[PDB]
Amino acid sequence: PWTLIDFYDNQPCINLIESKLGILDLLDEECKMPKGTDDTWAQKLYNT
Amino acid sequence: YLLEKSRVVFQAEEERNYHIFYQLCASAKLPEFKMLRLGNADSFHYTKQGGSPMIEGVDDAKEMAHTRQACTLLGISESYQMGIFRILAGILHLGNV
Amino acid sequence: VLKSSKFKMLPELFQDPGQTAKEHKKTVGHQFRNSLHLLMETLNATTPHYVRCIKPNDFKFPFTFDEK
Amino acid sequence: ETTALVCDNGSGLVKAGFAGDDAPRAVFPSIVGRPRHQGVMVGMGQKDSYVGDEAQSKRGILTLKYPIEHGIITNWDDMEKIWHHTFYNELRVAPEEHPTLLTEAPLNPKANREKMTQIMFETFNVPAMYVAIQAVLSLYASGRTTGIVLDSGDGVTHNVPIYEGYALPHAIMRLDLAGRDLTDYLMKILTERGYSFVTTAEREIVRDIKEKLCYVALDFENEMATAASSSSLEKSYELPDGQVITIGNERFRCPETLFQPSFIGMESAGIHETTYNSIMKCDIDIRKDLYANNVMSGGTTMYPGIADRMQKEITALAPSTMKIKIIAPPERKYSVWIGGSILASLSTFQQMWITKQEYDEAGPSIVHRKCF
Amino acid sequence: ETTALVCDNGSGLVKAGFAGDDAPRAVFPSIVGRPRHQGVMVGMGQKDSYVGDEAQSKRGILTLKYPIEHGIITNWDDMEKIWHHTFYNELRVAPEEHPTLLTEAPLNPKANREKMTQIMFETFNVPAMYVAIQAVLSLYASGRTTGIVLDSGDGVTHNVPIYEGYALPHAIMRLDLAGRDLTDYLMKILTERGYSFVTTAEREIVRDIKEKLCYVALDFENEMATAASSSSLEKSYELPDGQVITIGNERFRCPETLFQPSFIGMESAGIHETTYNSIMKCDIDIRKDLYANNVMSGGTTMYPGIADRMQKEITALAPSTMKIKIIAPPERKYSVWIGGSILASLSTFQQMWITKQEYDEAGPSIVHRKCF
Amino acid sequence: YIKPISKLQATNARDALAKHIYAKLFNWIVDHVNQALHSAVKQHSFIG
């Protein structure tokens, strides 16, 4: 039975990176917001 | 795929960008490269940032010849090889702007 | 400006709004993300076989194995 | 992707295009044409009424109505024809498919937002909608997070203070001088040299004379004496009819009413003096960065020499310990639309939309409740 | 070996660093800021509320709270942010790694130590703690064991009499008039010369004017006559908005009220009479050594000319056949911290700490058992 | 409109141009490699 094999899924981690509001998305969103900086980027990360 | 383009213009402590640039800078003594007005490998802003121009145990001056040999084995003409080196010298001089 | 150059190679370099317009605008991360999607769509169309190569010591010594 | 449209109702001009573009696809006058004579031929394939570039082209046959005046939409069936032309004819994209962002002057009447909303959700069936203050978009475009934004269109003029992205609502100034009342003044000064313009169909010529010839004096009475003494300043313009008009000091009197609104009989202070009074209404610890960050925005700021006139005549009102700076970019005629093209592309913004599904639950009272 | 932290929570400023340093790592105003204005930009990466130099830098957006008044913590949800910032951000040290030495003004409420103890062991997880009266460290810093110590800061001022490391608990006088009430009183006089300060975001200017401009009168009552004659008594200073202020008879009328508290409708006498009455409560064997070892301490004592006024007005009330010396060293803002830096570094001190095991066994009341 | 730019933008632009020239040159060398390696026969399948 397939129910015995538990599937470990790193999709939650990939979603943390590539999806909307992900660490890359907020980086691009920070690159075009006026006067964005590594510090405020980090703040967005914590907030989110 | 996935070429690390950012390395071309930025290097952390004791890193280097792509080897071809140091091969070229090491070749600044060769007659055909006189016109490229090359300096030493720390004279260029895109190569001096790492503070490690020489890899101990590696002759960039000879890797240049192995590179020219490989190009020629693939039939890239000497004209194209000089074009490549003209462009790379361009990138180096551009960084000094 | 560069496309007008003196020797054949420089005009040759750019050869194949529209995609190439936005392409100049795309950030490195977005380019990477896309390049990775292309790689993934390439590999997902295919059957993988995997190999791992490991370095046993930092001094290039034959047949010596540093556990650390 | 279904990207949002950015559709700057403004007044007098619509600027429209897709978020992420650096300039709008569509730039046309927000103007409604009806024919004023009885149409004479039979079997012609006649059309009832004309919008935008048609109404500019055919104007000698037409009545021109602006449905938008002083940032208030005043005729909803006409405004609905302009949106209908915008989506279906000018962008040629179906509004049920994509979100739209719309722009508004600050401090506006409440029902202006609500009819804008109901018309978007029922008639156009827009899947998602938003309204954003015109001046706030300008900072995203001018690359700053602290500024005071002098935003002045055809319809209306306003100043909005922003310090590090908190807008300061008590200090937002709005004024009814704008590109249209400079134009209607340009008629009552053109009358001095005998030239005449009295009809809706020729008002758009005065509006184009205004654009090419006009400029701002750094100090008014010495240039007023200069061009009253020397003809060296005068220039000539060909009307459509092939007639030449010629203009001297008069081409710098029309922008001067922005700095001296007594010339059109208003009490209120106009653009340098309201910019300074808006800065003074913020509390003291931020005022220096406002004096550093004045941003010009919208088409009524395009006059040659107005950047230097603001920098000079604010330096007369500010303390001499300052540095006073005007940021006057050449792109500025579009900076409110460029600003919305940045805003509607921010990922953090995507949570913000009023969706139709939320409006279908809450009714048209939603706008003030979730939106900006 | 792991050094303990020395952390003079004080009032108005937080002072912190490691035992064995010669100056603090961290000196910042003890302030928590909240935004009052409307959040309008979107995606700005806004932060709910601010600690220390961030709240000072951005103060024009904010309402400013001090969580401490009169050496009492009055908001624990605010106060915890200041310690959090102190350890993790500003010192960059985990409080869980090593013991902590903390400071308090004498006579303050019994619950204040119970709440601190509970917070340090439970919430911050410090391995061990001790609390020391600010004035005692001023002796260790001034290299002395017999004194009367006036530590006079923001928030509170107090006298503690000590003979060779033996404290005199019957003879402790405390007065809550302090550098913050010179700041609020400087507002209540500045209003006469027409300049204005009513808001927390500009109160921090009043606090900065005091620091640069002020001096201590040798006598108020001739200087009160002087300011009808002299413009040499006035000075001028540049506000952040670029205005120049000029100030006269204030510069002896407000900052001097630590020497004359009758001005604000309270019964009590100034720092001079509480210093002398603290000696009058002291035992008669010792009075020549106390009058010789007055130690001045804390940032509110930093004025040029404080020594000679203290020397004068204690000599005027004490018999002139006794001898008066006021010890006011150039370090005097930091001595309360400097004393904690040497004291916590002595091997002889290492026995004193309240360890977490003792609190987890006894409950929060244990400070009253093992401290003074 | 021709608009002037900040030194930061000028340095970012210069560096973006160099990164782009390099990425194109790389792709051109790879195209010469591909031309030296290619054959006219229709590829039925491959192993990557």
From Swiss-Prot, chain A:
It comes from Mus musculus (Mouse). This is Unconventional myosin-Va. May be a homodimer, which associates with multiple calmodulin or myosin light chains. Interacts with RIPL2, the interaction is required for its role in dendrite formation. Interacts with MLPH. Interacts with SYTL4. Interacts with MYRIP. Interacts with RAB10; mediates the transport to the plasma membrane of SLC2A4/GLUT4 storage vesicles. Interacts with FMR1; this interaction occurs in association with polyribosome. It comes from the Eukaryota. Processive actin-based motor that can move in large steps approximating the 36-nm pseudo-repeat of the actin filament. Can hydrolyze ATP in the presence of actin, which is essential for its function as a motor protein. Involved in melanosome transport. Also mediates the transport of vesicles to the plasma membrane. May also be required for some polarization process involved in dendrite formation. The chain holds residues 483 to 530 of 1853 of the full protein. Detected in melanocytes. Belongs to the TRAFAC class myosin-kinesin ATPase superfamily. Myosin family. Transmembrane segments: none annotated.
UniProtKB/Swiss-Prot annotation, chains D, E:
This is Actin, alpha skeletal muscle. In vertebrates 3 main groups of actin isoforms, alpha, beta and gamma have been identified. The alpha actins are found in muscle tissues and are a major constituent of the contractile apparatus. The beta and gamma actins coexist in most cell types as components of the cytoskeleton and as mediators of internal cell motility. The keyword Acetylation applies. It comes from Oryctolagus cuniculus (Rabbit). Keywords: Acetylation, ADP-ribosylation, ATP-binding, Cytoplasm, Cytoskeleton, Hydrolase, Methylation, Muscle protein, Nucleotide-binding, Oxidation. Pfam families: Actin. The keyword Cytoplasm applies. It catalyses: ATP + H2O = ADP + phosphate + H(+). Oxidation of Met-41 and Met-44 by MICALs (MICAL1, MICAL2 or MICAL3) to form methionine sulfoxide promotes actin filament depolymerization. MICAL1 and MICAL2 produce the (R)-S-oxide form. The (R)-S-oxide form is reverted by MSRB1 and MSRB2, which promotes actin repolymerization. Can be mono-ADP-ribosylated on Arg-174 by SpvB of Salmonella spp. This modification blocks subsequent polymerization and leads to cell death. It comes from the Eukaryota. The modification ADP-ribosylarginine is found at residue 174. InterPro entries: Actin (IPR004000), Actin/actin-like_CS (IPR020902), Actin_CS (IPR004001), ATPase_NBD (IPR043129). SUPFAM superfamilies: Actin-like ATPase domain. The modification Tele-methylhistidine is found at residue 70. CDD domains: ASKHA_NBD_actin (cd10224). Belongs to the actin family. Its main location: cytoplasm. Actins are highly conserved proteins that are involved in various types of cell motility and are ubiquitously expressed in all eukaryotic cells. Its EC number is 3.6.4.-. One of its GO terms (molecular function) is magnesium ion binding. The modification N6-methyllysine is found at residue 81. PANTHER family: ACTIN. It is found in: Cytoplasm, Cytoskeleton. The gene is ACTA1. GO terms for biological process: actin filament bundle assembly; actin filament polymerization; mesenchyme migration; positive regulation of gene expression; skeletal muscle fiber development; skeletal muscle thin filament assembly.
